[PDB]
Amino acid sequence: VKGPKHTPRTPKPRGRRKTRIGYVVSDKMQKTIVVELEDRMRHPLYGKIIRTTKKVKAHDEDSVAGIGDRVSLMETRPLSATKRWRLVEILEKAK
Amino acid sequence: ARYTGPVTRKSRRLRTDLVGGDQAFEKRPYPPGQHGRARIKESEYLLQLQEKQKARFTYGVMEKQFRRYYEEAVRQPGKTGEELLKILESRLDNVIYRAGLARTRRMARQLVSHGHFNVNGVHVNVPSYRVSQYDIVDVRDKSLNTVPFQIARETAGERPIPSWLQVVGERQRVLIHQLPERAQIDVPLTEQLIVEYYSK
């Protein structure tokens, strides 16, 4: 009958998600955007740096993104069957 | 297994007297058999093969056992012919030969095999026991006052003792100073044609 009745938690540091940057390929999906990311990596046998491209989906809370549009992302929980990313902000939109 | 056959026959084929002192050899130093007096084709493979045989029938080592000695000798730093002849010189039956307790190699092998020795107070009967630095090589108290062990008491002089081991007085015991390097190794054979044999 001495103790505090609430043991405070051990402070666990908040781990971070993955942030990426890419162009926009589609916009006609009703609060959903399509982003073409890209990343370069060595060939395992030959050593040449191979450039490849992905296409991820992301969530627009308000539908302001068109074709072009360098966008910054951050990955989230599953929001649909395929959406795993959210739009953070638009830097240097479609010229 | 052992060889358990004629001993002059494999000194004549290898053209080198492998045991110490032989009058059957040097009456016929040419290889045995019926086509012995030929002037034979000396292949490069023959010079590497017959050089490896000179060490197997000096030390009394089978081929699978001699190959495992090569496996670590090529894998230790330094050289390969240095470390192969080192670990062959460290076997217990060779240590008994260098100390003068036996006339030949084959009688050095039985006196280890029949359990007439100790090392660190421990009864051993394995002829390929490898001694290390600072190993005493003692001898069984039962094996004192025995014919082959007291017939080698008075014959302590006709063969030299190498520098890396040492024999003492009537309490017979052999002390290993260090592992033998190269210069105190008896040389009937070169040490590079064995190394070149296992590269084929």
Partner: protein, 113 residues
């Protein structure tokens, strides 16, 4: 339940052991959470080592030792310094040592001359 148990990993007639923190829903030689010592019951006393500061962590969080490991913690004083028993000093005992390799070798050179 998290158990502190022994793990047989020797030869056929030489049962070497490791003092390992494991789960009860786990076979003997599976993945342990952590190895916190060893135990060789073939030397003349035995060869007992417990980590004894990670043992004090796992006991203080709820890992129940098995009955040979509980005897080992009483010998090393770890169970006594956890429960508050007065025998918290280590009552383990090593074998009486042998003179080394060089000391016997020089005492044969001293005796031969």
């Amino acid at each position: 339940a998290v158990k502190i148990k022994l793990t047989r990993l020797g030869k056929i007639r030489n049962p070497q052991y490791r003092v390992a923190v494991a789960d009860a829903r786990t076979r003997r030689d599976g993945r342990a959470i952590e190895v916190i010592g060893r135990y060789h019951p073939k030397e003349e006393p035995s060869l007992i080592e417990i980590n004894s500061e990670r043992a004090q962590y796992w006991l203080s969080v709820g890992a129940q030792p098995t009955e040979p490991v509980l005897k080992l913690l009483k010998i090393t004083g770890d169970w006594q310094k956890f429960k508050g028993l007065p025998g918290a000093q280590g009552r383990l005992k090593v074998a009486a040592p042998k003179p080394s390799k060089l000391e016997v070798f020089n005492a044969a050179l001293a005796a031969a001359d």
